[PDB]
Structure formats: C-alpha cells, structure tokens
Amino acid sequence: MYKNQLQELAQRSCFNLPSYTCIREGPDHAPRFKATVNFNGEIFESPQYCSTLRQAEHSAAEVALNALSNRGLEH
Template identity: 85%
Template structure:
C-alpha cells in the first residue's frame, strides 16, 4: 500500500521512481528484513526489522511518505496522494474491524448556497468523534474526517496496538 503511494508521489512530482534495497538477517527458518528506499536523492529506512521483505519495504516507504508529508511544498502533494486514494477511510475501517468495534459512522452537513456548497463531516468510532477540515464535496469532507480520526487514533495507546498489527504497516 505505502509502496504504491510512494510510486504515485514520484510520478506526480516527476521524481525518479523509488529504489529499494534490503538487509536480511537471522536463520533461514526465521529471517528478518530491514529495507531502505532511495527516493528523490534521500534514503529512508524501515524503523524496525520485519518478518517479510514486503513488510520492510512498506515500512520504509511509509517513513519516506511521512517525511515528505511533513515538509514544505511537497507536504500538500504527499497528503493529496494519500488522500485521493481514500487510504485514511480504509485504514479507519480496518482499525475498527480489528479492534472489534462498529464500523465508523460519518455525519456530513452541507451548508452554503446551492452553487457553492460547503461540507463538514464528523466521523464516530469507538464512541469518539473526529471532525475534519471543511471541503467542497461530501466525499472530500468524509476523507478529511477520516484523516483527522486516523491521526488522533495513531497517538492513542489503545489503538496503537491494533494499528501495529497491520502487516503492511510493519
């Protein structure tokens, strides 16, 4: 998932495609992998060793995406690539499923004149409500709410364990 997003970012930004390298350690019956992705002249390493090469590459790609999302002009582009694909809504839904919770419930309110609508959305998960930035479309407002929820839940100790269990985030 993160490898695909990083490749999309490269294509949209006219960067060279990401190149992955890997370190393998451990016995044949229990190998561990740590990946590095070279992207836009920088190297980004997976933070920990992973049980599969795929997981290690996704972890390195996630580090690269998060780094670019936190920086100046490319921040908006990296966030847009993740956002356009609806990844935050998917992650939020999977988090709820894995935690044994009801699926997220989105409440969207339309305001403004008919020819220039404005939407705001709140998502409820685990009894908590998260509101995203307003948007010009209902779909984008829902994505913004999911992004706000995901960002908050990643910092929540209870959900950190659930999120850590995602194979593509390791």
C-alpha cells in the same frame, strides 16, 4: 497498497524513478530485515524487525511518506 502510494507521488515528481533495496544483517539465528528507498538523493529506511520482506517495504514506505508530509527540520 502503501508501496504503490510511493510510486504515485514519486512519478508525480517528474518521473523520480525511486529505487528500493533490502538490507539484511544480524546473527544467522536472529536475522534482521529492513527496507531502504532512494528519494532524490535522500535515502530512507525502517529500523524495525519484520517477519517478512514485504512487511519491511511497508514500514520503509511509511517513513518516506511521513517526510513528505513534514520535513521535521526547523531553525
């Protein structure tokens, strides 16, 4: 699973012991679900609307993995 992959790399970093917190916001009629994860002092989230909570975790996990592959910061 994609979520599992985070743990694999997270543990490989000397027991990172990351934490994930779900963020709920928006109007009651149109609720918004997001997934947030802490990574060595750097927290990432997925600003996307997901039908289910599990889906939100998937999106958030993808973002975290992308950062690892490429920081995206230059000069």
